[PDB]
């Protein structure tokens, strides 16, 4: 439970994002460049984190008989002195691949900003994480940047798209832990998966798609409103409309159909999933720039991206129980 | 494409079902009895079929630290002289476990009748299958009876229920075929999965839940109507209302939320899925006897079960291309 002091206590976003805003179609050199950038960001700025790749290959509707590689990026930090197989993971996810067609599509909100948002937020809590663990409970932080979320084919095809998340959920679901472990599979050790998608455009609308995580959705909404009351949001004023259009809906009145995305493989295998995607609550339509050459840096609203970063930081900090550890200011001390 | 002669050409259902209508909670001796019955049915009546078990264990909300076993039953027949890894499988599924609470629940429509319906239909096409293959294309027939579909816990819990189908979809998704094979995984070799659930009650209402299989739903509806026109349905007259309430909906107007069941793990991993479940189209409510001691043999409508068996037989026969092979009558010949 975070205090207003904790919130006031909360590599600029533009610096972290710039290197992501290039074509990164899976299997191409753009993908390798963006991937090594992300890994090097964690290796230099978050050295306490372990980084890892998960690799698969599969044919797609446009690759004929060639097998395209799909490389998920995983990075995590666990409380020290704990068997990693006893750790529950808060898991933050976005996809780092880009749509192939049209040639040179960038995917600024889809989903480079979401990736930057995650990198920024975990960077901002790392020091408080160290502070709270130095003091000491069986919960860690994890990010997954998925590859191959985007579909390649013209037709609608059940096995097209979500290549990275299907491969990752599959292999983690059969990564069987010791029988002495608190958790039964690597997949089952995910306590909450938060997928960010289509973020960075103005005035997003975020619905609540999974009853089993509506409480977390409401916690997220509560934090947004508190940061709005504190005057800490740059894209909205103290009287702005809340992004979270289901914040008052009762868990038993939720009836929106989920949007097919990276959370579906994990959810269908039994993971609690929270899908933070900007889509009209009534029509289901995505932002106007979606899958258009206009989803570029010049249509990003960076005040909204900064707000998203601040909110995700606050959410992760509340969830990992960092209250009283966000401020490390020391008076009369050098 | 089936002719009216083919349809007229189409171990009574009660004989196949009787042994299934006992408690069969996973891990208990009822489960082992029902499972060995099903396997022996295939071994004796369908000797051309290979049978196989897929085994996992997992804790549940009511087993404390004990791991409950979950045993899926799989049976299949492939065209001869074909590498099994080049075969696409039409796959018919129902769950053979029963709800634990209340004690002694039977699950007549949930889902013993669906299981009997599948066993009856594949029995009825086996001879035509032999006939069409003797004449000779890369498509086989497969049944899965899943265990642990039912949830055990009081609360709603993302990883409770669907134990068998989650385990089976997971392991088949990583069962990687030779690179020379037409299909890339055992999971990916499923061409169409048809899940039958909550069948055997009067006047079912079947909605279309997946656009990517709406065509198959419409083929199924078409067969129903033709069999109604032929006077071949025992539960409905030539003017009865069609069970398939979405038969005229355009693929682009489908907007019903899927019901969480055994198809979700397979669908989320990229399998085309057709969910034949009786639920009110407007409210989502299941049959009245659902999860009540009234879901027993005495509330089954066996004319409806016979109709379902006939319709599933017709669907599988149309799908496997058995036209002209359903009638083996020979005039002036002993």
Automatic annotation (TrEMBL), chains A, B:
GO biological process, one term: proteolysis
GO molecular function: glutaminyl-peptide cyclotransferase activity; peptidase activity; zinc ion binding
Keyword annotations from UniProtKB, A to Z: Acyltransferase, Hydrolase, Metal-binding, Protease, Signal, Transferase, Zinc
InterPro entries: M28_QC, Peptidase_M28, QC/QCL
Domain Peptidase M28: 88-315
EC number in record: 3.4.-.-
Family: Belongs to the peptidase M28 family.
UniProt-recorded name of the protein: Peptide hydrolase
């Amino acid at each position: 439970n975070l205090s207003n002091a904790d919130l006031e206590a909360l590599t600029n976003i533009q610096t972290i994002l710039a290197p992501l805003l290039r074509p990164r179609v899976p299997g191409t050199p753009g993908s390798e460049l963006v991937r090594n950038y992300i890994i090097q960001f964690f290796n230099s700025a978050l050295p306490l984190w372990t980084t890892e790749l998960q690799v698969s290959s599969s044919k797609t509707p446009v690759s004929g008989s060639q097998r395209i590689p799909f490389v998920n990026i995983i990075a995590y930090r666990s409380p020290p002195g704990l068997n990693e197989t006893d750790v529950g993971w808060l898991t933050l996810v976005a996809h780092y691949d880009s749509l192939k067609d049209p040639e040179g599509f960038i995917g600024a909100i889809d989903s480079a900003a979401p990736c930057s948002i995650i990198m920024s937020a975990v960077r901002s809590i790392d020091a408080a994480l160290t502070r709270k663990w130095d003091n000491m409970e069986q919960y860690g932080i994890q990010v997954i940047f998925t590859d191959g979320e985007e579909s390649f084919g013209n037709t609608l095809t059940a096995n097209d798209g979500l290549y990275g998340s299907r491969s990752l959920a599959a292999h983690w679901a059969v990564d069987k832990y010791p029988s002495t472990a608190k958790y039964e599979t690597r997949l089952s050790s995910i306590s909450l998966l938060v997928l960010l998608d289509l973020l960075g455009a103005k005035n997003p609308q975020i619905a609540s798609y999974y009853p089993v995580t509506h409480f977390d959705y409401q916690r997220l909404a509560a934090l947004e409103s508190r940061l709005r009351e504190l005057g800490q949001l740059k894209s909205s004023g103290i009287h702005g409309k809340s992004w979270f259009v289901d914040r008052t809906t009762d868990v038993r009145s939720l009836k929106r159909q989920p949007v097919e995305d990276d959370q579906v493989p994990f959810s269908g295998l039994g993971v609690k999933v929270l899908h933070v995607i900007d889509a009209d609550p009534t029509t289901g339509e995505f932002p106007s720039v979606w899958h258009t050459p206009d989803d570029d840096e010049n249509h990003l609203d960076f005040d909204t991206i900064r707000d998203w970063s601040l909110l995700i930081t606050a959410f992760a900090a509340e969830w990992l129980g960092l209250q009283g550890f966000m401020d490390n200011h020391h008076h009369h001390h050098h």
